[PDB]
Design an enzyme around this catalytic site. Structure first.
Site, PDB file in Angstrom:
ATOM      1  N   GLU A 161     -10.473  -3.657   4.471  1.00 34.35           N
ATOM      2  CA  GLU A 161     -10.205  -4.810   3.622  1.00 34.35           C
ATOM      3  C   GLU A 161     -10.477  -6.117   4.359  1.00 34.35           C
ATOM      4  OE1 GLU A 161      -6.143  -3.880   2.346  1.00 34.35           O
ATOM      5  OE2 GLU A 161      -6.772  -4.503   0.336  1.00 34.35           O
ATOM      6  N   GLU A 214      -3.649   4.662   5.765  1.00 32.38           N
ATOM      7  CA  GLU A 214      -3.811   3.328   5.183  1.00 32.38           C
ATOM      8  C   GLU A 214      -4.333   2.332   6.216  1.00 32.38           C
ATOM      9  OE1 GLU A 214      -3.602   2.319   1.637  1.00 32.38           O
ATOM     10  OE2 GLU A 214      -3.721   4.456   2.102  1.00 32.38           O
ATOM     11  N   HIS A 255       0.816  -1.215   0.000  1.00 33.25           N
ATOM     12  CA  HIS A 255       0.000   0.000   0.000  1.00 33.25           C
ATOM     13  C   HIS A 255       0.852   1.269   0.000  1.00 33.25           C
ATOM     14  CE1 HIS A 255      -4.190  -1.552   0.902  1.00 33.25           C
ATOM     15  NE2 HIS A 255      -3.423  -2.637   0.951  1.00 33.25           N
TER      16      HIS A 255
END
Lengths: 438, 55
Positions: free
Chosen positions: A129, A122, A53
């Site tokens: 996720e 993030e 990421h």
């Protein structure tokens, strides 16, 4: 006969491997790394994925916005993926945009900012996720399969890592991970398509020359997994489709039974009711399943790692009262790999594979993936001639011998998800791993 | 008795009926299991087992 894969090294130990194709106008270049989630411990599990990421969140020179613009201006795209043992970062571009793309990759890998602000941003993205993989049923099944088969071992951990680690990953541990693991002797710069090898080696000398070498350089694809026969049941009566995976311990990349396991896998093969040809396939299991409507699909797999593997099948079915039949007939076909297979099935499967292994490579990204995987797992690109010879050496005796030591009467790892009331207990499934008549 | 006290007639009829009665008993044993098979076995907790069955 495909063009030869050229291979060079740098002084630090970075491998450059390329396969040119003067018929295409695009090129895939990227960095294949022999490192992944397996290299984490329990405390920093999730770091490798986290870094992927942050690699696109801005470098010492270009900011996130500048990075976006640079790639947009090149015209192609960048892509990355982290697995258990492999990390890939590649760039598909035009022929003459290859020097730009190599420069961008070298930058995001070596000189990424990992700013606390971006880490924090993030941390929420990745948290989300965790609650959206829940939908990707095949991934759920295979993540539970590794977790159970390699219980409390590094291969048993997920790539995302636990929620707890996501909240506590610091830039320090990120930096430590990529400094220890992303070393030159573990990295391969790969080019496929419209690339000149000599040009790619020059670009590597320009951008990847100041990469650290590891203290103890082992060969590429160098690793003890102790498989656990076990089951995970994730029953959900509200789902219409059951998803079931069954696996035994399989073979590593460099096993002497590597090709024998692939041939055995091809004898069972794949099936999908949505494909028109599937009702006519030669596979016995395919015929049983299609004639009786036992499943929507099945896919045989033989997944390999550096020191172990999983060999098995993944089934999806809406026929919730005949899950027992589906599993029963599947394991009875596996039993026949030990008891009944002859030259008939073996030669057929070899024929299918000889083509299949070449067919797979039908674009520059596929070719680059093949070069990169082979260089990071075997330490060399195996030529189609060598592969054709290794397949030809697989006999029916080899398949039977392999099945008798790997499948017959062995412990399985079993995962079921969905309306699996009809899936019997462990013992009754595992009892189908042998035949009392034999 | 087949007579005015327990004697030979009684013994011979008891033999024939003793031979028969176990076959009748086996039939009723089977019947009570067929009747049970609609609800299944109870269990020591007294709750449903439809949630968790074993072969």
């Amino acid at each position: 006969v495909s063009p030869k894969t050229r291979t060079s090294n740098l002084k630090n130990g970075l491998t450059i491997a390329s396969e040119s194709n003067p018929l295409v106008q695009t090129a895939t270049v990227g960095v294949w790394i022999d490192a992944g989630s397996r290299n984490e411990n329990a405390y920093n599990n999730g770091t490798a994925h986290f870094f992927e990421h942050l690699a696109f969140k801005g470098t010492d020179k270009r900011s996130q916005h500048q990075l976006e613009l640079d790639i947009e201006n090149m015209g192609g795209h960048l892509n990355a993926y982290t697995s258990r043992e492999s990390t890939v970062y590649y760039a598909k571009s035009f022929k003459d945009d290859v020097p730009k793309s190599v420069e961008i990759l070298a930058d995001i890998l070596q000189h990424s900012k990992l700013a606390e602000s971006a880490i924090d941003r993030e941390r929420e993205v990745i948290t989300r996720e965790l609650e959206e993989v829940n939908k990707q049923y095949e991934e759920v099944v295979f993540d539970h399969l590794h977790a159970t088969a390699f219980m409390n071992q590094p291969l048993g951990r997920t790539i995302l890592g636990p929620r707890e680690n996501i909240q506590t990953i610091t830039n320090t541990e990120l930096r430590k991970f990529i400094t220890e693991n992303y070393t030159a002797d573990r990295m391969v710069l790969v080019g496929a398509g419209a690339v000149d090898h000599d040009a790619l080696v020059e670009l590597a000398e320009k951008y990847f020359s100041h990469l650290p070498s590891s203290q103890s350089p082992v060969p590429l694809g160098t690793p003890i997994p102790n498989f656990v026969g076990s089951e995970v049941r994730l029953r959900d009566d509200t789902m219409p489709v059951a998803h079931i995976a069954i696996a035994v311990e399989g073979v590593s990349w460099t096993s002497e039974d590597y090709y024998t396991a692939l041939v055995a896998q091809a004898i069972i093969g794949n099936y999908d009711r949505a494909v028109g040809t599937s009702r006519h396939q030669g596979s016995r299991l395919s015929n049983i399943v299609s004639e009786n409507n036992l499943a929507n699909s099945f896919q045989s797999f033989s997944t390999s790692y550096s020191d172990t593997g999983l060999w098995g099948i993944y089934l999806t079915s809406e026929n919730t009262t005949q899950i027992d039949d589906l599993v029963h007939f599947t394991l009875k076909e596996w039993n026949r790999l030990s008891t009944s297979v002859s030259n008939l099935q073996v030669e057929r499967a070899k024929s299918q594979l000889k083509a299949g292994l070449l067919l797979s490579l039908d674009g520059t990204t596929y070719v680059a993936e093949d070069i990169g995987r082979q260089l990071t797992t075997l330490g060399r690109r195996v030529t189609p001639a060598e592969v054709e010879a290794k397949l030809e050496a697989v006999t029916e005796h080899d398949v039977r011998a392999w099945a008798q030591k790997t499948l017959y009467d062995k412990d399985i790892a079993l995962v079921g998800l969905g309306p699996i009331e009809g899936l019997y207990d462990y013992n009754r499934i595992r009892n189908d791993m042998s035949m009392m008549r034999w | 008795w087949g007579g005015f006290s327990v004697g030979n007639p009684t013994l011979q009829r008891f033999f024939a009926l003793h031979y028969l009665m176990p076959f009748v008993l086996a039939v009723f044993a089977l019947l009570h299991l067929i009747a049970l098979h609609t609800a299944g076995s109870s269990n020591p907790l007294g709750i449903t087992s439809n949630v968790d069955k074993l072969s």
